[PDB]
Amino acid sequence: ADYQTIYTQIQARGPHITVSGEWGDNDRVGKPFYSYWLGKIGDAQIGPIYLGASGIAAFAFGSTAILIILFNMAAEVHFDPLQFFRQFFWLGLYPPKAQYGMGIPPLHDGGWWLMAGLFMTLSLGSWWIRVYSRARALGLGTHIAWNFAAAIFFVLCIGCIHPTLVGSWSEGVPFGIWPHIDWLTAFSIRYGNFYYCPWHGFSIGFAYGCGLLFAAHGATILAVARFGGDREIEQITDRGTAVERAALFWRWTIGFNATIESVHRWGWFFSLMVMVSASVGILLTGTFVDNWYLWCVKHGAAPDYPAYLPATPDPASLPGAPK
Amino acid sequence: MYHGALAQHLDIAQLVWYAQWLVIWTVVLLYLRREDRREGYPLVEPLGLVKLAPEDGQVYELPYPKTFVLPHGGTVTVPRRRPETRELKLAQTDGFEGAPLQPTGNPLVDAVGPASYAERAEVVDATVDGKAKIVPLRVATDFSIAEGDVDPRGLPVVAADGVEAGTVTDLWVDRSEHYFRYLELSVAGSARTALIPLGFCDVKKDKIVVTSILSEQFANVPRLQSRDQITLREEDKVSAYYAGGLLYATPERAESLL
Amino acid sequence: ALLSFERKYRVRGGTLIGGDLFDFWVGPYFVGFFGVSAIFFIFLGVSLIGYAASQGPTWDPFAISINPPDLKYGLGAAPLLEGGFWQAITVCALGAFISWMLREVEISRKLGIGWHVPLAFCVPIFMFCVLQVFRPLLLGSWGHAFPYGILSHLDWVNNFGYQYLNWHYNPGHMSSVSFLFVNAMALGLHGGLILSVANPGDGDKVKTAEHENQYFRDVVGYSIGALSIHRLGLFLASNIFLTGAFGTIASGPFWTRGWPEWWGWWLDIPFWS
Amino acid sequence: CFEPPPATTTQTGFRGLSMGEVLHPATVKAKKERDAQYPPALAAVKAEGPPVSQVYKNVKVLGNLTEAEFLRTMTAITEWVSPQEGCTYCHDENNLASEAKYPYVVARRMLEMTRAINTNWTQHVAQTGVTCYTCHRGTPLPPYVRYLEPTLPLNNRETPTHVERVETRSGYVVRLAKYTAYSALNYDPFTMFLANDKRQVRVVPQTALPLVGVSRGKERRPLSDAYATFALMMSISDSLGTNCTFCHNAQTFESWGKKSTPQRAIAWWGIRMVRDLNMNYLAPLNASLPASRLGRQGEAPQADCRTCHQGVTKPLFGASRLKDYPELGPIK
Ligand code: BCB
Ligand code: BCB
Ligand code: BCB
Ligand code: BCB
Ligand SMILES: C/C=C1/c2cc3[nH]c4c(c3C)C(=O)[C@H](C(=O)OC)c4c3nc(cc4[nH]c(cc(n2)[C@@H]1C)c(C(C)=O)c4C)[C@@H](C)[C@@H]3CCC(=O)OC/C=C(\C)CCC[C@H](C)CCC[C@H](C)CCCC(C)C
Ligand SMILES: C/C=C1/c2cc3[nH]c4c(c3C)C(=O)[C@H](C(=O)OC)c4c3nc(cc4[nH]c(cc(n2)[C@@H]1C)c(C(C)=O)c4C)[C@@H](C)[C@@H]3CCC(=O)OC/C=C(\C)CCC[C@H](C)CCC[C@H](C)CCCC(C)C
Ligand code: HEM
Ligand code: HEM
Ligand code: HEM
Ligand code: HEM
Ligand SMILES: CC(C)=CCC/C(C)=C/C=C/C(C)=C/C=C/C(C)=C/C=C\C=C(C)\C=C\C=C(/C)CC/C=C(\C)CCCC(C)C
Ligand SMILES: COC1=C(OC)C(=O)C(C/C=C(\C)CCC=C(C)C)=C(C)C1=O
Ligand SMILES: [Fe+2]
Structure with a gap:
């Protein structure tokens, strides 16, 4: 067996290295230290970490959102500390229960939620700049920043843009562990079953597809760690037996194959599209489609099944039904 | 009236579904599938007595060449014609195109099958600052074994056939990633060292156990040109040698397990 | 027909069973014994699917559905049209899945590489079994499994979920989802990093292993390293099902109430009730 | 557990x-x-x-x-x-x-x-x-009655902890969760739906596309109505000791015919029955009961699905x- 693919048998210790940025080198704060147990399944050195303006900004806005949320949650168990720790998951910070339209809601009915919502956004923006800048400082392409951008956009979509598109803040995602979860059902229910939204189908496809792809990629690279498959950059500029063998595994199995670079593109594409497909799905919901199941029905896509228990008329529609 | 309705029965989301599909196949076929062809193309085959055409499909499926400008100097352009020129000791076992090749000599040394290497650069891999990357700890003196792990220097290496085959002399570290990649051993009864990639080693407290090959076959492990340096292509020869053991170390190994 | 580097690898040997009999390629495909079996079940399974689909009322692809038997048929054999087809197609699926798996082992053996891919492929097969075989066994009828249809299998997922009131509070599901989301994020991160180092833009030099490490150390204070992100990726991926398997198995054989209520074990500690 | x-x-x-x-x-x-x-x-x-x-x-x-x-x-x-x-x-x-x-x-x-x-x-x-x-x-x-606030335990033959006592404001979210089958849905479907006939339980649209004139701005029902309807259904389910698919084919919660069981039509009438009992018999009894019977708003105890069903369909x-x-x- 190759135990190296399971864990690092003999860890190497050596001097801390620093690749110099086009700026910010003096913002790397902290002394590297080394975990021996971490060393067994990853690199042993934790820290240093770059500080920097964008990052500090992100930290500051993010922490303000958290204070707004935690403070409203704390109010909900009436500032009882033990009931706070007990009911945490159930605690939430909500949007307009009431229809204010796009009216700025009172602090008590969604005011605080738009606040936290706003600061969280600035937090995501600041962080994005950090993620984009660090690449440029280090002389790298910006592929990560752009994959991140799609993810943030998706949040914006369920957070702001959809609620704005239909004209109601009431539709936004609450903050809280069970609350943001309950929203998923409320939103699905209101819009006629998200299983029947084509773009939810695409998203899941790409999501499952990432599981498929990272299992197959990760496993492919462990399978050729013996030949230095893990050194992907140099297998790109100078193809070696690692990626030849990896490529042939996949050719002999499925009939076609990637290269060691292009598979990271398929990977990147599939990740990106989870969020991109999701965003379209949301932009279409409310704006142009009210009932996704009914929409499918309209277009002929829906399965239908026999009654098993007898078919039940709507009592409401009975002649001489109450209301 | 409805938000979204375009016409007779056409609505927005319905058009977007078609657009979505289109975008996905464009990117997949016209882009991703061509990026998949920067290595190993054009496909090779036998040939014909008379043939004087570019073969359109071989132009169509390829991407435009891209050029990497390499960190310490040079360029690589892909796709390019990397032909396999070097001769192979294999014989076709049947007449039909799909049939496997058989080695005609010793596949371990002839480097065929599992024992093949890529025609990698005869260049020493380099750290970011320009030094040699994979070097023995005799050379990488600022590196050490983490406290708690076995120091394998001194231990015997025990081949698949149970026989002690040498003594670990050194570990080669990757000073770009801080990670051991080979053991160096004094081959028993030869006046030589062998490297062996750490994935082929079972590191015990009292012995390193190497299952790929029998004690005899360490003899013909690929040789390095320098002693404190290893090229990208040498790494491939050394590694491939033991990978070849897994199929070829003994006669049984190429045949069905069950 | 051959990649430019391919001929030197196409050697005999590596088979699990069969030996030289099926040791050969059709086109790019390695065949082998299990290539032979894989194709037999695919053919079987697909023929069944067509015959079944023809007996039913639709040839619209989204609408076609081949469903398991009623609960009353228990774990017995059901009339072909009342879930008999479904039972057949399921044996065919398993045969194909597992043959696909073993065929990968023979290709791995021949290439002298780790068996990791066939191994990793066992996880999705395992989850197929939990849903279609194990859980229906524990509950006592084949009727609990999911139907074979593009859209109809979503209606089963839907109803199964709401059988337990809110499936989102299922702790096995929570773990599963988390792994789904982390994995998608990591694959984006990993693809992006490699592309960014190999493709910096303009005429910049391709960067290095030490840049990969530096970038994440800056961004998040840690870099797991090149071999180890592939290990992590396989782990996060596999734990999508390995943890999910539990939440699925538990619903019915081991918990019959809504999933929210399960959390009572926390909420209802008497110290704070 | x-x-x-x-x-x-x-x-x-x-x-x-x-x-x-x-x-x-x-x-x-x-x-x-x-x-x-x-x-x-x-x-x-x-x-x-x-x-x-x-x-x-x-x-x-x-x-x-x-x-x-x-x-x-x-x-x-x-x-x-x-x-x-x-x-x-x-x-x-x-x-x-x-x-x-x-x-x-x-x-x-x-x-x-x-x-x-x-x-x-x-x-x-x-x-x-x-x-x-x-x-x-x-x-x-x-044993199972409803005030105009959530209360605990649901079986009033059990005696409260401190936090369950309606007077304890920090026990509210629990009082409410335990009424809606342990969810965090921040709504009380009793006072919203069952005490009277003011609210409409159906929230789902019956056209594929948004009808112009009911689908933007204050024209819209707020999404919170969907959480209420969901909560009412968590409550009904737990009240009857059952799950949604006793009544719905979750493929389309909003449809009837083949997509609904007979028990859903019955439940429809139960909603109607319960409101009637509450508006025309039970709520009036605040006129006739000791103050010790009445809740914090001066309401008489009233009926929901549980009062009768007590966890059985x-x-x-x-x-x-x-x-x-x-x-x-x-x-x-
Ligand atoms: C417990 C939950 C489950 C679930 C939940 C689920 C949801 C909620 C959704 C899907 C979706 C999809 N599912 Mg289902 N599913 C499917 C297949 C499918 C696809 C129709 C589609 C896209 C999936 C994807 O791209 O993954 C990634 C894999 C990739 C990218 C590689 C390509 C695979 C290829 C697209 C598969 C196509 C299969 C064909 C139907 C062929 C069928 C056999 C033919 C040859 C006879 C299979 C084959 C199986 C089996 C055998 O276990 C399965 C099991 C399950 N799904 C579970 C029961 N699935 C999505 C959909 O759009 O539904 C229609 C979606 O919304
Ligand atoms: C009953 C309800 C249902 C539902 C409702 C639902 C909704 C309401 C939505 C989805 C959506 C999606 N669903 Mg569906 N769903 C899914 C899977 C999925 C995803 C593929 C996709 C969401 C994309 C995502 O990754 O978000 C997770 C990723 C996120 C949230 C991005 C985060 C990025 C961000 C930058 C990170 C920031 C972190 C910071 C630390 C911030 C912290 C700051 C502090 C201050 C707070 C599966 C696989 C199934 C199955 C198997 O049953 C299913 C069933 C159902 N879903 C039910 C039918 N689903 C979405 C969609 O695709 O719409 C079409 C959508 O909106
Ligand atoms: C449309 C669908 C939605 C959805 C659906 C959803 C479901 C269905 C479920 C969750 C779940 C969860 N969700 Mg929700 N979600 C959450 C947050 C959460 C968590 C409470 C939990 C698990 C998170 C996770 O594993 O992600 C992945 C985690 C990541 C990517 C971790 C990042 C790792 C990292 C890179 C390591 C960093 C290194 C260190 C900093 C190093 C330190 C050393 C230094 C300092 C020197 C956030 C913060 C947000 C947004 C966008 O702000 C969000 C949006 C949404 N969720 C959407 C509304 N969510 C699960 C749950 O538990 O529900 C209760 C669950 O079941
Ligand atoms: C209303 C009901 C809901 C529901 C009900 C549900 C159920 C009932 C189950 C899940 C499960 C799962 N859900 Mg939930 N879910 C999920 C996500 C997920 C997955 C992580 C997880 C595993 C899926 C699976 O089993 O695939 C299975 C996929 C398989 C088996 C694929 C097999 C592939 C096979 C090996 C090969 C197939 C080959 C093809 C035929 C080949 C075709 C050849 C062609 C291509 C050439 C999210 C992220 C969300 C959101 C965002 O809300 C969500 C919402 C919901 N889930 C709803 C609340 N979910 C499962 C779980 O584990 O939860 C505990 C589960 O059982
Ligand atoms: C399909 C692809 C996807 C995708 C992609 C990508 N995702 C990325 C990137 C890409 C490519 C990045 O490059 C970026 C990153 O950097 O990675 C290293 C990132 C990220 N994805 C995160 C979370 C995540 N991704 C999710 C989903 C998807 N991602 C989808 C699936 C989910 C889901 C699943 O729920 C989650 C939860 C974060 C880890 C990270 C942002 C951090 C942030 O935005 O900073 C925001 C900053 C803050 C909140 C600062 C405040 C924090 C402190 C501790 C608060 C302390 C307060 C206290 C009260 C007082 C303290 C006082 C003090 C003095 C002591
Ligand atoms: C946690 C890790 C995961 C993971 C991992 C890995 N995944 C792998 C590998 C690894 C590592 C491979 O090595 C192997 C491969 O080769 O990759 C290219 C593979 C593969 N993953 C496929 C599909 C896929 N992976 C999914 C999920 C995950 N993968 C999870 C996420 C999903 C989901 C989520 O729905 C799908 C649909 C195939 C493309 C491929 C098998 C080909 C096959 O088996 O050929 C043999 C079979 C056929 C060609 C057809 C058989 C038809 C039968 C007889 C009749 C059909 C019946 C069927 C039940 C009807 C369904 C109808 C209805 C539901 C619609
Ligand atoms: C189980 C937790 C559950 C869910 C989910 C659910 C949802 C639900 C929705 C979305 C509606 C709205 C339909 C529309 O907008 O037209 C709805 C309506 C009714 N339900 Fe329901 N339902 C769940 C569970 C149950 C159970 C267990 C039953 C039968 C006892 C039931 C019944 C009904 C009835 C009746 C209605 C209509 C309400 C009215 O017309 O006033 N549901 N449900
Ligand atoms: C216990 C067994 C019991 C007896 C005995 C009893 C008798 C009784 C009679 C004879 C009358 C008529 C008296 C008259 O002239 O008005 C009568 C009427 C009513 N009762 Fe009674 N009753 C017994 C028990 C109970 C209990 C436990 C209650 C309260 C729940 C109760 C109530 C009433 C009511 C009301 C009436 C009048 C009924 C009407 O038709 O208006 N009784 N009882
Ligand atoms: C059946 C004919 C019947 C009788 C008799 C009866 C009596 C009754 C009494 C005596 C009270 C007052 C109790 C008190 O001490 O305050 C009372 C109160 C309530 N009831 Fe009743 N009841 C009869 C029938 C029914 C039925 C069928 C229901 C449920 C649909 C029901 C419910 C209630 C409720 C609620 C109250 C209010 C709270 C209270 O005063 O205790 N009863 N009933
Ligand atoms: C509260 C709005 C409520 C619901 C919901 C509800 C539902 C319900 C169902 C689904 C049935 C049919 C069950 C079946 O298997 O067919 C059913 C039956 C009866 N109910 Fe009910 N019920 C609700 C409320 C109430 C209340 C408040 C009472 C008591 C005054 C009550 C009573 C009954 C009775 C009696 C039946 C049984 C009829 C039978 O055929 O046995 N319900 N309920
Ligand atoms: C103000 C006007 C008029 C215009 C601007 C509109 C605007 C831009 C609004 C934005 C709204 C947005 C972005 C809303 C989005 C909300 C979403 C998607 C929220 C979803 C999930 C939230 C969840 C799960 C989290 C809730 C909170 C908690 C769990 C507590 C947080 C606790 C911590 C993070 C602990 C940190 C501890 C540390 C040591 C790691
Ligand atoms: C060769 O490629 C890669 C590495 O080698 C240098 C990494 O070190 C990392 C960074 C790994 C981190 C920050 C681990 C934390 C956890 C998660 C889930 C992202 C990534 C993404 C990568 O792709
Ligand atoms: Fe990789």
């Missing part, structure tokens, strides 16, 4: 849709046994003689009964509601026609309500009918005394 095999399962939809009930057999056995405490019918008496309208002084509702019949009913009424208390819970010990004690006049209104359900709400209660036992279960205060597993005590309806 888990329940061992086997599970009892039923099918409520076409095969392969995963619709049906999922019962733990011990829990079902436990409710079975509790509902088994339903006292048997008192042996029938013969209608000898004069309607008690002649015979007695202050009989309004049951005046058509002969004496033995009437007292038969009074004995039953006593074993259902106030067994531990005997006749005098409602009667002046020395004057049977005395309305002195409130249980009297409440019992009088309850005899009217009980005849109402059995005569006018046959769409729901059918030929099973209800009796005083259905709600009361042998105690004057029925049919109350007392379908037991009836309707043939045995026709006084109680259906009133021809």
